Design brief:
about 50 residues; Chromosome partition protein MukB (chains A, C); 4 chains; rod-shaped; about 0% strand; part of a larger assembly; mainly alpha; SMC-kleisin complex; Chromosome partition protein MukB; ATPase; dna binding protein
Chain lengths: ~50, ~50, ~50, ~50
């Protein structure tokens, strides 16, 4: 389902990497949201101008 | 300012594409990690390849 | 540590309960931060104004 | 706008607190789930209370 034969013999490292990638989930989503809304506010300012 | 607005819309599209792609991909990663840590959170060690 | 004996004899169902809790974690945070983050930008804007 | 700043600071304090608590309790429950499915991911079946 993920990978096709993917180090099933010893997979703990992969769980750790996926935990890191979930941290990346949080970081990336928060960063994207904040940046896009700040530039939306910039859009609003430009609109009023 | 209209050119700025056009570029800003382009940037909105870029941010939305990035956010979508990352959120989906890492959500499926979340599902895979949950399956691993549920069905085989070192249940392979219980198996131990004995 | 959580629950006091809390049906430890056969606790399976609780794990699924925790999953819901886990979900409500992300939501409960993803919104929260954003909100404060939102006002942060607005605050800056206000300050600038 | 300075009164708006005061209200914004109030809201920021409220949300900061609420997020801190909620994340703490939910993370502790998450760690509880991990301890369950790590120490006893149906490992009680191998224990089996024999």
């Amino acid at each position: 389902r993920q990978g096709r034969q993917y180090q099933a013999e010893d997979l703990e490292a992969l769980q750790n990497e996926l935990e890191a990638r979930q941290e990346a989930l949080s970081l990336s989503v928060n960063e994207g949201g904040e940046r896009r809304m700040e530039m939306r506010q910039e859009l609003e300012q430009l609109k009023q101008k | 300012l209209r050119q700025r607005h056009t570029e800003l819309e382009r940037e909105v599209s870029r941010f939305e594409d990035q956010t979508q792609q990352q959120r989906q991909q890492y959500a499926q990663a979340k599902e895979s990690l949950t399956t691993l840590n549920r069905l085989i959170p070192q249940v392979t060690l219980l198996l131990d390849e004995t």
